[PDB]
Design a protein around this ligand. Structure first.
Ligand SMILES: [Mn+2]
Ligand SMILES: [Mn+2]
Length: 363
């Protein structure tokens, strides 16, 4: 219902290493009155899945309860059911895929009984996007309009398709559940067609759990791993993707990775860049890097130092009636400066531009 007067730009980070993987993450509240995003990041899983990893972003709505419960418990609902455990030995593709389906459906109903028993007041819901990573497979998991992508061989190899109510099959389901899609929203309100929680949207008599107005059913894709070609995976809520496309963000992260191996920092830059491109939502990014992720380049670091220094001289020159930061950014944009980070553009350089402005106009 409301925005803050000024954005909360404080970063919450995590990082880790194991099973040949490196990860960083960054979350920021931004312009929104609340922080309703959640996440999971775990390298090495219980019960003989030490060599497996799991990462996920949760974009909560109408509260954070559903998202928070998911970020702590979705993983064991997924792995601790009979479908995931099916066959005697290691789980098959089908096992893993049905395991995730069941995990999603069972946690949703689990939360529903919990809320029904304790007379819960919140009507919250949550998207989930994530990857379950085995020695030989990346399993992409999507439920809602959060998004994940795989960069392989300097390119977008795969990305998750957002569940929007106006998508043909989502629309079909919603209409069979006796609702409608008005513009982009389920009955004029909800901007997602798939999510955990939203129990008010799951009350149609004579319709299965996956045939309600809002569905908890996940979409899973098996991608065979490529030791040689797999570079990195990005997972993020719509707050990021609203203001950057797949190619852009993929290129941007690449440009950043060529400057630092610090992944929390790369994730920070994504979130800030997105804030400065005009995103007014909560923002959460997870970055998972494979052994052949882009490496720090001596030249790229130098190019960045030269750009940084150049940007600082430009700021000094511009302040000669003493223009404000907004007007300095305007001038710099109209200068069509070359060699700005791909995807990030000027926005990705605002922290550098602003630090300078503050050194020269600290009042
Ligand atoms: Mn949200
Ligand atoms: Mn959001």
């Amino acid at each position: 219902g409301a925005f803050l007067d000024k954005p909360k730009m404080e970063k919450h980070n995590a990082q880790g290493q194991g099973n040949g993987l490196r990860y960083g993450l960054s979350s920021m509240q931004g312009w929104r009155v609340e922080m309703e995003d959640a996440h999971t990041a775990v390298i090495g899983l219980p019960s003989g899945l030490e060599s497996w990893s799991f990462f996920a972003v949760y974009d909560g709505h109408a509260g954070s309860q559903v998202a928070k419960y998911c970020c702590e418990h979705l993983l064991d609902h997924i792995t601790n059911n009979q479908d995931f455990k099916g066959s005697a030995g290691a789980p098959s593709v089908e096992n893993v895929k049905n395991g995730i389906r069941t995990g999603f459906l069972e946690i949703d109903e689990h939360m529903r009984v919990m809320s029904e028993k304790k007379h819960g007041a919140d009507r919250s819901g949550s998207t989930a996007v994530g990857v379950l990573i085995s020695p030989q497979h990346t399993y992409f998991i999507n439920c809602g309009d959060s998004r994940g992508l795989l960069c392989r061989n300097r390119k977008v190899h795969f990305f998750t398709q957002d569940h929007k109510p106006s998508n043909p099959l989502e629309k079909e389901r919603i209409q069979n559940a006796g609702g409608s899609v008005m513009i982009q929203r389920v009955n004029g309100s909800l901007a997602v067609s798939r999510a955990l929680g939203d129990f008010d949207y799951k009350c149609v008599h004579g319709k299965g759990p996956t045939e309600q107005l809002v569905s908890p059913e996940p979409e899973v894709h098996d991608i065979e791993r490529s030791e040689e070609d797999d570079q990195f995976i990005i997972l993020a809520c719509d707050g990021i993707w609203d203001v950057m496309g797949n190619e852009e963000l993929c290129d941007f992260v690449r440009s950043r990775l060529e400057v630092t191996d610090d992944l929390e920092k790369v994730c920070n830059e994504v979130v800030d860049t997105c804030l400065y491109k005009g995103s007014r939502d909560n923002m959460s990014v997870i970055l998972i890097c494979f052994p052949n992720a882009p490496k720090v380049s001596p030249e790229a670091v130098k190019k960045e130092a030269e750009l940084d220094k150049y940007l600082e001289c430009r700021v000094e020159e511009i302040i000669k009636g003493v223009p404000d930061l907004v007007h300095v950014m305007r001038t710099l944009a109209s200068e069509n400066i070359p060699s700005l980070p791909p995807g990030g553009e000027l926005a990705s350089k605002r922290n550098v531009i602003e630090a300078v402005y503050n050194r020269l106009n600290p009042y």
